[PDB]
Amino acid sequence: SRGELLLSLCYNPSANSIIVNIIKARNLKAMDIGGTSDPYVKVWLMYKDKRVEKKKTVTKKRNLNPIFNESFAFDIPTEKLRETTIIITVMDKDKLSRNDVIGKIYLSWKSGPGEVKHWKDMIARPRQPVAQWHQLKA
Ligand SMILES: [Ca+2]
Ligand SMILES: [Ca+2]
Ligand SMILES: [Ca+2]
Ligand SMILES: [Ca+2]
């Protein structure tokens, strides 16, 4: 159990855009020896197996329940929706080694049940932000 992340998705087909809001996380795994992590969240837009664009939040120091409230806009033509995946990875920044992966969420029509439900809800509710909590998976 790696933690959970609360995020919203808002897709506007007329503008060919999605807004991904990384809201907050809870109960993150501690990936530093003293019982904390320094979390930031990266958001990768994929088209088929290609990386299109990457965005990331600030880093919160020594915080297993960070609150971000950061909003990221991506261009996504309606014609590319079926081939789109949004991969969200919560990371632990480290000074003296490679940053550690806390966990990931994959958003598309071909992911886990909660993820697919959130994606379909976004599609069904154009221009409405839809927020859900997801379990982070290693
Ligand atoms: Ca670490
Ligand atoms: Ca760290
Ligand atoms: Ca490390
Ligand atoms: Ca590093």
PDB file of C-alpha atoms and ligand atoms in Angstrom:
ATOM      1  CA  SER A   1       0.000   0.000   0.000  1.00  0.00           C
ATOM      2  CA  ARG A   2       1.964   2.923  -1.487  1.00  0.00           C
ATOM      3  CA  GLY A   3      -0.518   5.774  -0.859  1.00  0.00           C
ATOM      4  CA  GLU A   4      -3.373   7.382  -2.754  1.00  0.00           C
ATOM      5  CA  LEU A   5      -3.510  10.430  -5.065  1.00  0.00           C
ATOM      6  CA  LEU A   6      -6.521  12.709  -5.599  1.00  0.00           C
ATOM      7  CA  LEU A   7      -6.638  14.224  -9.079  1.00  0.00           C
ATOM      8  CA  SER A   8      -9.221  15.704 -11.393  1.00  0.00           C
ATOM      9  CA  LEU A   9      -9.603  15.456 -15.161  1.00  0.00           C
ATOM     10  CA  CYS A  10     -11.563  17.930 -17.298  1.00  0.00           C
ATOM     11  CA  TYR A  11     -11.708  17.295 -21.062  1.00  0.00           C
ATOM     12  CA  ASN A  12     -13.169  19.894 -23.434  1.00  0.00           C
ATOM     13  CA  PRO A  13     -13.668  18.333 -26.862  1.00  0.00           C
ATOM     14  CA  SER A  14     -14.394  21.682 -28.502  1.00  0.00           C
ATOM     15  CA  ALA A  15     -10.974  23.039 -27.419  1.00  0.00           C
ATOM     16  CA  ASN A  16      -9.163  19.728 -27.780  1.00  0.00           C
ATOM     17  CA  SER A  17      -7.841  20.079 -24.254  1.00  0.00           C
ATOM     18  CA  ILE A  18      -7.557  18.308 -20.993  1.00  0.00           C
ATOM     19  CA  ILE A  19      -6.809  19.837 -17.646  1.00  0.00           C
ATOM     20  CA  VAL A  20      -5.238  17.477 -15.116  1.00  0.00           C
ATOM     21  CA  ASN A  21      -5.299  18.837 -11.558  1.00  0.00           C
ATOM     22  CA  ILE A  22      -2.997  17.093  -9.117  1.00  0.00           C
ATOM     23  CA  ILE A  23      -4.833  17.899  -5.894  1.00  0.00           C
ATOM     24  CA  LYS A  24      -3.265  16.040  -2.935  1.00  0.00           C
ATOM     25  CA  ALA A  25      -1.991  12.677  -1.748  1.00  0.00           C
ATOM     26  CA  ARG A  26      -2.487  10.650   1.423  1.00  0.00           C
ATOM     27  CA  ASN A  27      -0.610   7.929   3.242  1.00  0.00           C
ATOM     28  CA  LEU A  28       2.383   7.942   0.911  1.00  0.00           C
ATOM     29  CA  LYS A  29       5.072   5.346   1.405  1.00  0.00           C
ATOM     30  CA  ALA A  30       8.194   6.606   3.188  1.00  0.00           C
ATOM     31  CA  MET A  31      11.140   6.237   0.787  1.00  0.00           C
ATOM     32  CA  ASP A  32      13.787   7.870   3.023  1.00  0.00           C
ATOM     33  CA  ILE A  33      15.263   6.214   6.143  1.00  0.00           C
ATOM     34  CA  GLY A  34      13.878   8.668   8.664  1.00  0.00           C
ATOM     35  CA  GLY A  35      10.260   7.817   7.815  1.00  0.00           C
ATOM     36  CA  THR A  36       9.428  10.450   5.234  1.00  0.00           C
ATOM     37  CA  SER A  37       9.485  11.157   1.487  1.00  0.00           C
ATOM     38  CA  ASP A  38       9.915  14.343  -0.558  1.00  0.00           C
ATOM     39  CA  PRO A  39       7.116  13.909  -3.062  1.00  0.00           C
ATOM     40  CA  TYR A  40       6.549  15.457  -6.456  1.00  0.00           C
ATOM     41  CA  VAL A  41       4.196  14.258  -9.164  1.00  0.00           C
ATOM     42  CA  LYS A  42       4.964  13.901 -12.860  1.00  0.00           C
ATOM     43  CA  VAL A  43       2.306  13.734 -15.511  1.00  0.00           C
ATOM     44  CA  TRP A  44       3.161  12.211 -18.911  1.00  0.00           C
ATOM     45  CA  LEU A  45       0.851  12.434 -21.902  1.00  0.00           C
ATOM     46  CA  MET A  46       1.281   9.431 -24.200  1.00  0.00           C
ATOM     47  CA  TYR A  47      -0.005   8.830 -27.704  1.00  0.00           C
ATOM     48  CA  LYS A  48       0.199   5.130 -28.531  1.00  0.00           C
ATOM     49  CA  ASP A  49       3.653   4.157 -27.184  1.00  0.00           C
ATOM     50  CA  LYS A  50       5.067   7.663 -27.735  1.00  0.00           C
ATOM     51  CA  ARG A  51       5.764  10.304 -25.097  1.00  0.00           C
ATOM     52  CA  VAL A  52       4.169  13.588 -26.109  1.00  0.00           C
ATOM     53  CA  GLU A  53       4.588  15.908 -23.159  1.00  0.00           C
ATOM     54  CA  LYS A  54       5.635  15.936 -19.529  1.00  0.00           C
ATOM     55  CA  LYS A  55       4.692  18.226 -16.669  1.00  0.00           C
ATOM     56  CA  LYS A  56       5.474  18.068 -12.973  1.00  0.00           C
ATOM     57  CA  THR A  57       4.577  19.606  -9.663  1.00  0.00           C
ATOM     58  CA  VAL A  58       6.826  21.200  -7.115  1.00  0.00           C
ATOM     59  CA  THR A  59       8.495  19.002  -4.501  1.00  0.00           C
ATOM     60  CA  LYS A  60       7.112  18.973  -0.948  1.00  0.00           C
ATOM     61  CA  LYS A  61       9.784  18.244   1.634  1.00  0.00           C
ATOM     62  CA  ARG A  62       9.365  15.495   4.265  1.00  0.00           C
ATOM     63  CA  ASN A  63       5.644  15.067   3.653  1.00  0.00           C
ATOM     64  CA  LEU A  64       3.618  11.859   3.341  1.00  0.00           C
ATOM     65  CA  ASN A  65       0.316  13.783   2.860  1.00  0.00           C
ATOM     66  CA  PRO A  66       1.213  16.550   0.445  1.00  0.00           C
ATOM     67  CA  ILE A  67      -1.265  19.085  -0.889  1.00  0.00           C
ATOM     68  CA  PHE A  68      -0.357  20.362  -4.368  1.00  0.00           C
ATOM     69  CA  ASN A  69      -3.415  21.864  -6.146  1.00  0.00           C
ATOM     70  CA  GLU A  70      -1.437  22.247  -9.372  1.00  0.00           C
ATOM     71  CA  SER A  71      -3.202  22.367 -12.711  1.00  0.00           C
ATOM     72  CA  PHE A  72      -1.720  21.218 -16.051  1.00  0.00           C
ATOM     73  CA  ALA A  73      -3.219  21.706 -19.515  1.00  0.00           C
ATOM     74  CA  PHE A  74      -2.561  19.379 -22.441  1.00  0.00           C
ATOM     75  CA  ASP A  75      -3.563  19.562 -26.078  1.00  0.00           C
ATOM     76  CA  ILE A  76      -5.431  16.360 -27.017  1.00  0.00           C
ATOM     77  CA  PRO A  77      -7.334  16.261 -30.297  1.00  0.00           C
ATOM     78  CA  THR A  78     -10.596  14.345 -29.947  1.00  0.00           C
ATOM     79  CA  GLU A  79      -9.350  12.094 -32.776  1.00  0.00           C
ATOM     80  CA  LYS A  80      -6.438  10.940 -30.565  1.00  0.00           C
ATOM     81  CA  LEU A  81      -8.453  10.036 -27.428  1.00  0.00           C
ATOM     82  CA  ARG A  82      -8.563   6.253 -28.072  1.00  0.00           C
ATOM     83  CA  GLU A  83      -4.799   6.190 -28.315  1.00  0.00           C
ATOM     84  CA  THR A  84      -4.170   8.416 -25.263  1.00  0.00           C
ATOM     85  CA  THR A  85      -2.762   7.364 -21.932  1.00  0.00           C
ATOM     86  CA  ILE A  86      -1.977   9.758 -19.081  1.00  0.00           C
ATOM     87  CA  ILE A  87       0.661   8.268 -16.797  1.00  0.00           C
ATOM     88  CA  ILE A  88       0.933   9.896 -13.362  1.00  0.00           C
ATOM     89  CA  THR A  89       3.926   9.003 -11.200  1.00  0.00           C
ATOM     90  CA  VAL A  90       4.501  10.086  -7.626  1.00  0.00           C
ATOM     91  CA  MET A  91       8.233  10.366  -6.968  1.00  0.00           C
ATOM     92  CA  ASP A  92      10.451  10.911  -3.937  1.00  0.00           C
ATOM     93  CA  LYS A  93      13.217  13.451  -4.628  1.00  0.00           C
ATOM     94  CA  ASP A  94      16.625  12.378  -3.261  1.00  0.00           C
ATOM     95  CA  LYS A  95      19.783  14.459  -3.058  1.00  0.00           C
ATOM     96  CA  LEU A  96      22.389  11.683  -2.988  1.00  0.00           C
ATOM     97  CA  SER A  97      20.820   9.019  -5.238  1.00  0.00           C
ATOM     98  CA  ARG A  98      18.336   8.582  -8.078  1.00  0.00           C
ATOM     99  CA  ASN A  99      14.857   9.713  -7.129  1.00  0.00           C
ATOM    100  CA  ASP A 100      12.628   6.889  -5.875  1.00  0.00           C
ATOM    101  CA  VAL A 101       9.285   5.868  -7.389  1.00  0.00           C
ATOM    102  CA  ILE A 102       6.469   5.890  -4.839  1.00  0.00           C
ATOM    103  CA  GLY A 103       3.848   4.698  -7.343  1.00  0.00           C
ATOM    104  CA  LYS A 104       1.915   5.216 -10.561  1.00  0.00           C
ATOM    105  CA  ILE A 105      -1.557   5.549 -12.051  1.00  0.00           C
ATOM    106  CA  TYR A 106      -2.367   4.865 -15.730  1.00  0.00           C
ATOM    107  CA  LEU A 107      -5.426   6.691 -17.125  1.00  0.00           C
ATOM    108  CA  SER A 108      -6.988   5.369 -20.357  1.00  0.00           C
ATOM    109  CA  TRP A 109      -9.780   3.030 -21.490  1.00  0.00           C
ATOM    110  CA  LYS A 110      -7.379   0.121 -21.061  1.00  0.00           C
ATOM    111  CA  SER A 111      -6.259   0.333 -17.486  1.00  0.00           C
ATOM    112  CA  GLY A 112      -7.553  -0.860 -14.097  1.00  0.00           C
ATOM    113  CA  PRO A 113     -11.219  -0.589 -13.167  1.00  0.00           C
ATOM    114  CA  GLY A 114     -11.088   2.640 -11.124  1.00  0.00           C
ATOM    115  CA  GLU A 115      -8.857   4.271 -13.728  1.00  0.00           C
ATOM    116  CA  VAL A 116     -11.125   3.291 -16.606  1.00  0.00           C
ATOM    117  CA  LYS A 117     -14.179   4.501 -14.681  1.00  0.00           C
ATOM    118  CA  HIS A 118     -12.557   7.893 -14.093  1.00  0.00           C
ATOM    119  CA  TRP A 119     -11.520   8.159 -17.757  1.00  0.00           C
ATOM    120  CA  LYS A 120     -14.991   7.257 -19.018  1.00  0.00           C
ATOM    121  CA  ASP A 121     -16.613   9.683 -16.565  1.00  0.00           C
ATOM    122  CA  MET A 122     -14.389  12.474 -17.894  1.00  0.00           C
ATOM    123  CA  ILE A 123     -15.465  11.620 -21.469  1.00  0.00           C
ATOM    124  CA  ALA A 124     -19.151  11.461 -20.521  1.00  0.00           C
ATOM    125  CA  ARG A 125     -19.030  14.835 -18.723  1.00  0.00           C
ATOM    126  CA  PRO A 126     -17.374  17.302 -21.143  1.00  0.00           C
ATOM    127  CA  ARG A 127     -16.125  20.525 -19.540  1.00  0.00           C
ATOM    128  CA  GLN A 128     -16.851  19.161 -16.032  1.00  0.00           C
ATOM    129  CA  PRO A 129     -13.917  18.446 -13.746  1.00  0.00           C
ATOM    130  CA  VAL A 130     -14.171  14.942 -12.382  1.00  0.00           C
ATOM    131  CA  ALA A 131     -12.060  14.176  -9.266  1.00  0.00           C
ATOM    132  CA  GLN A 132     -11.211  10.774  -7.794  1.00  0.00           C
ATOM    133  CA  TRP A 133      -8.746   9.151  -5.437  1.00  0.00           C
ATOM    134  CA  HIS A 134      -6.550   6.393  -6.903  1.00  0.00           C
ATOM    135  CA  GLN A 135      -4.261   3.879  -5.225  1.00  0.00           C
ATOM    136  CA  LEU A 136      -0.661   4.270  -6.281  1.00  0.00           C
ATOM    137  CA  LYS A 137       0.865   1.063  -7.620  1.00  0.00           C
ATOM    138  CA  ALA A 138       4.532   0.219  -7.848  1.00  0.00           C
TER     139      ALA A 138
HETATM  140 CA    CA B   1      14.502   8.184  -1.076  1.00  0.00          CA
HETATM  141 CA    CA B   2      13.907  11.869  -0.461  1.00  0.00          CA
HETATM  142 CA    CA B   3      17.007   7.014  -4.184  1.00  0.00          CA
HETATM  143 CA    CA B   4      18.240  12.678  -7.418  1.00  0.00          CA
END
